[PDB]
């Protein structure tokens, strides 16, 4: 059984250097033709290939990132390290390392190369956020209005993830949509949480927001304005 | 470099259907192509290697064929765990490219979004910033287009949006879009509009308000 696992800092600041380690078990980087590669996935985006290294020590890099990447192996520790320099916000992504089989051999003679055509086992992935922000609690603002009515709370400018939001201390669940946060160009996150109700219920509505990182709890009752 | 284009980018289906996803390469990649299935929150999982070989432990409903520039993955009888995003990967040329992915989600009847526009709170305005949010609630299919207009000027580069994951009961999606402006710029205009295009809407729907109108 082959397993891989990524480790490194979850948060990194722009211009800094990011070092990611892939520790694995079940194979050796001294085994014939084996490879270990790195692939990343920005939130909501497609997979992007970064680099790979083989047991005979040949290395290859994405041409778009070549100047900022270094991949290396430590055979005796069963680890592969990928160093990315000068990171910027667009480098925020989940980073995965993965195993690549070498050709099948028969009495130590390569006879099948079809198994090298895939990365067959992947690590769970490590989430890395690139932002120059210091920990900071959100500002919470009201969002106020088939014949459904909508209202919500805008949880703005906080760092880092995550934040939790519930409605009426947990009693309101139907019609609730808490969207995934977006990382603003400022380096702070922002999210909305809304709830749809029969245009008659306008019943009381309060969003309970909690950002553990900054010890910031807020309950904000939201109503249909006009005094 | 080498381009790998997946089709369709998104696809709706129901348990028991037969689906086929295709991947085309800009130059021939021989048989060096792999297919993966990635479920939300998890790493991609290898299904098919070397264009058509079934990876060990992978269920037989998955099949891959093709070589050169055109490949296809077909799942013969879709199971609930197959609602996910699929990717193809080329390993003939460096860099070892991935396709853009194809999202497979639960099919349901087309549903237009209920749209709502929220002006910025007076509380936010006092801090100097103005957030205008637009909500597209419970729609299907997933693709939707939101266009912000301020006093008829098309907005660009000053909004961000996020979409919920498919609802497990509804099978619909919801989308939140935030337009952000300084309090000053905000004050220099009156009509804030959120224009929405979607398959379930005969023509674009616009929700708006005039700033300061009381």
């Amino acid at each position: 059984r082959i397993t891989l696992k990524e480790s490194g800092p979850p948060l990194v600041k722009p211009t800094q250097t990011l070092t990611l380690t892939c520790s694995f078990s079940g194979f050796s980087l001294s085994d014939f033709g084996v490879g270990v590669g790195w692939i990343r996935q920005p939130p909501g985006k497609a997979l992007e290939w970064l680099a790979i290294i083989y047991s005979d020590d040949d290395k290859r890099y994405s041409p778009s990132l070549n100047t900022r990447l270094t991949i290396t192996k430590d055979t005796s520790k069963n680890q592969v390290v990928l160093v990315m320099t000068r990171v910027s916000p667009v480098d925020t992504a989940t980073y995965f390392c993965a195993h690549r089989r070498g050709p099948t051999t028969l009495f130590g003679v390569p006879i099948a190369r079809g198994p090298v055509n895939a990365m067959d086992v992947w690590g769970q992935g490590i989430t890395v956020t690139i932002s120059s922000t210091s920990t900071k609690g959100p500002s919470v603002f009201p969002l106020a209005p088939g014949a459904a009515a909508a209202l919500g709370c805008l949880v703005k400018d906080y760092f880092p993830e995550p934040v939790t939001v519930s409605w009426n201390s947990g009693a309101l669940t139907s019609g609730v949509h808490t969207f995934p946060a977006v990382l603003q160009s400022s380096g702070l996150y922002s999210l909305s949480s809304v709830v749809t109700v029969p245009s008659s219920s306008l019943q009381t509505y309060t969003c309970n927001v909690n950002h553990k990182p900054s010890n910031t709890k807020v309950d904000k009752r939201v109503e249909p304005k006009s005094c | 470099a080498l381009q790998l284009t997946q089709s369709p980018s998104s696809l709706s289906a129901s348990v028991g259907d037969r689906i086929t996803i295709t991947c085309r390469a800009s130059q021939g990649v021989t048989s060096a192509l792999a297919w993966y299935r990635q479920k939300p929150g998890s790493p991609p999982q290898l299904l098919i290697y070397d264009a058509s070989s079934l990876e060990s432990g992978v269920p037989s409903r998955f099949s891959g064929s093709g070589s050169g520039t055109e490949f296809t993955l077909t799942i013969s009888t879709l199971r609930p765990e197959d609602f996910a995003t699929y990717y193809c990967q080329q390993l003939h040329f460096y860099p070892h490219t991935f396709g853009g992915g194809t999202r497979v989600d639960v099919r349901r009847t087309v549903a237009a979004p209920s749209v709502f526009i929220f002006p910025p709170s007076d509380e936010q305005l006092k801090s100097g910033t103005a957030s205008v949010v637009c909500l597209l609630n419970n729609f299907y299919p997933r693709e939707a287009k939101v266009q912000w207009k301020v006093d008829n000027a098309l907005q660009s580069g000053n909004s961000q949006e996020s979409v919920t994951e498919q609802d497990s009961k509804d099978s619909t999606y919801s989308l939140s879009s935030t337009l952000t402006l300084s309090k000053a710029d905000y004050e220099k205009h009156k009509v804030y509009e959120c224009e929405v295009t979607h398959q379930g809407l005969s023509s674009p729907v616009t929700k708006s308000f005039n700033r300061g109108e009381c």
């Binding site: 033709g33 | 060096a32 390993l91 003939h92 040329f93 460096y94 070892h96």
Partner: peptide, 7 residues
Amino acid sequence: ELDKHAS
């Protein structure tokens, strides 16, 4: 270019 077990 070609892969490590390309041609």
